[model samples]
Target: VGGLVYFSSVSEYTHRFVEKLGLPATRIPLHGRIEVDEPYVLILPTYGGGRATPDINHGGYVPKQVIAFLNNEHNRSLLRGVIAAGNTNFGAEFAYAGNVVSRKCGVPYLYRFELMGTPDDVEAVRAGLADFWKEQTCHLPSQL
Candidate 1:
């Protein structure tokens, strides 16, 4: 699924994806600090930025072009690779055999995913989340 959304950081994007899909996630580090926890997904730069920041003044990690370089091709390819790799491991509605869970009220979802690794990988996540949903669907009771 080639869905598009904008985010300023890997963490923020991953958090949003998890919430929308009800997919349980786990935190797995990337190269170094540059990482997104699984449900890890690369928050690619599409007019890149965040809700926390406004472009005019810029806040948070506004990746500045090192030398006024506009390597559109390079950036695109790099982002593509990032998406590929990130998607390779993450997706929607993943069912974890070990009772992996969604977030609870007054709790931050990303915090758990940011610290633990989830069992369900990309394909599982997508398959599990394939079901349709609506506003009222969110609070329905699950079968025991």
Candidate 2:
């Protein structure tokens, strides 16, 4: 199966969500760095302060830690998709980080969920990744 990469805030809301997925996952540390060797899906929380408009230039939506992780060329290249966590109350800006990462990394925006997610959300992601990883393997070049 493919890997799952995620970033969690001090609140650890995203952390709790990842735990429920029951998959091998990596957490992008707030004060450290990471580089993944295989294609993986990134999950991160939106940081727009519950605002409607996302100020990309000011770097107000996506977490800075996530940006740092993807700044690594190898990590960016291995990224296959993105999932974002946000509060639905944010309206137009809900899960906005997923859209930004998807556009910048040229990967698909695979999914989005509210904070921590529910049992149903966790199940959906688990099943979805099974199919997603299978499709990715078929497209990837065969190793010698």
Candidate 3:
């Protein structure tokens, strides 16, 4: 159940990062179902504005699809960790959606990716994650 979520606009961004890590993940959309039997890691791209607000919806709001995914108890139980991609320029809002999801879910390992170019971007993302997760390899349930 190694899962991935990304917006269409940043598909290439996800591509470079995932392959560089040699992770075997299935690309799932925000609206897609989390059909897995074992615990799995999730990789996602976050969205948010620079403005701060009392609630995440106004600050670093999670998308409706992600919200819907959380509604399923099965999905909640299967979540192992989170890795969120974002632009640091957003300041408080940077990785806002990732922050909200990891906070609410009580999941550990939230990796962040600041803005970068081409191959250099993947290395930056890898450094933030490897020490914490360290040579981590994701497992996809054979059933999936």
Candidate 4:
């Protein structure tokens, strides 16, 4: 399973990086039609800010659609990995969106991207995916 899922406000670098990996990526907007397949890797990019409520932190200014998706257990079951993108200049909550999604999905394979990611960065990411797969069992949900 090599399905790619992304947000409407995704960075250009995310597009370029994923294209090189040669997986099928679909743009899921903040609202309107929402479609996704099982065994997919979710690429979540952070924007705006948010604070913790109780025990968990939240993504600030997040769209309703995104919040809806994150809460959907049906969708979470299909998630394989999460690659979160954010600007380091924004401080600690940079890739907050990704961290939230990863926790919701129960996926430990979370990758973080800071600054303008270069092509070389893609290699390291691919390596991490490879490493994770090596440790995973035969009943894995998706492949890198």
Candidate 5:
């Protein structure tokens, strides 16, 4: 899934289920289905899935513990791409919020990860997530 998302073009990114990620190219998000009424939070990873922390010994993915450390870092990011410029290629984008989700959506039965962008247009939406998740278990707002 990581390589699929990395090599995926906008045409691929904007799609739903495909052979690579086996997800709906356009309709599928990195995360799973998000209901308009369902509450969600942005979970960040402490380490990266690739070079940052290569736990390929167990698997090629990064360790969840390392990725979790990103929650409070000043430089938070989420890799998102759009099918732009008449090109189906996906571009990496950064979205900041108080917290982030490392991996949760996008693939079938896999996880999608994210981080809250700072001063990004998506802040308002992230704020909604914060408000919704703040009351949940073990969410340390001030720590981040």
Candidate 6:
């Protein structure tokens, strides 16, 4: 089955959410880099306006570490989808990072959940991914 790749900040809200999924997963570290050779979905949180830049033009909703992770050509090539975590209060920008990644990478925007997600979100994603991975295997060409 395809695995999951995620990035969590120091707060680890996204980390806790991934734990609930109970799927085979890998994490992008705060520093350093790694590559994924097989098809996988990425999950990450949106970093948006903060105290200093409340006007919403901060522009880096997608975490820099996650950007670095995708920068690896091998990793980007294997990516199948993206799920983003964000607060609903962010309005139009909620989970915007997922949209950005999906558009740029030409992968599906599989799902979006609020910070840490709820029980329902976890259950839904867990079940949804089972079907998603199965579909991906059928459509993707043999890696070798």
Q: Number of the top candidate by TM-score? A: 2
Instruction: Tell me each candidate's RMSD, in Å, in order.
Output: 15.7, 2.2, 6.0, 4.8, 15.9, 3.6
lDDT by residue (41-83, candidate 4, tens digit) is: 7776676764333112544533456667656777766778788
Q: Is candidate 5 or candidate 6 better by lDDT?
A: 6
Residues 1-144 of candidate 2: C-alpha lDDT, one tens digit per residue: 778999999999999999888898999998888788987899999985655565545467889888888889898888889999998888888888987888877888888999999999999899888988888657878689
* Tens digits of lDDT, candidate 3, 3-29: 444332344565556767655665556
Q: What's the lDDT for all of these models? A: 0.27, 0.86, 0.60, 0.64, 0.26, 0.85
Number of the candidate with higher TM-score, 3 or 4: 4
Report residue 113 deviation for candidate 2 (angstroms): 0.3
For candidate 5, report its TM-score. Answer: 0.20
Compare candidates 3 and 5 on lDDT and give the better one. Answer: 3
What TM-score against the true fold does each predicted structure earn? 0.20, 0.90, 0.66, 0.72, 0.20, 0.88
Global local distance difference test of model 1: 0.27
Stretches of model 5 off by over 4 angstroms after superposition: 1-42, 50-62, 66-116, 127-144
Off by over 4 Å in 3: 1-11, 30-34, 53-60, 115-144
Q: In terms of TM-score, which candidate is stronger, 1 or 2?
A: 2
- Best candidate according to lDDT: 2
* Native-referenced Cα lDDT, model 2: 0.86
lDDT head-to-head 1 vs 5, winner: 1
Give the Å shift of residue 97 in candidate 2: 0.3
- For 40-108, candidate 1 gives per-residue lDDT tens digits of 222222222333322223322222321011133342222211221122122231211011111111111
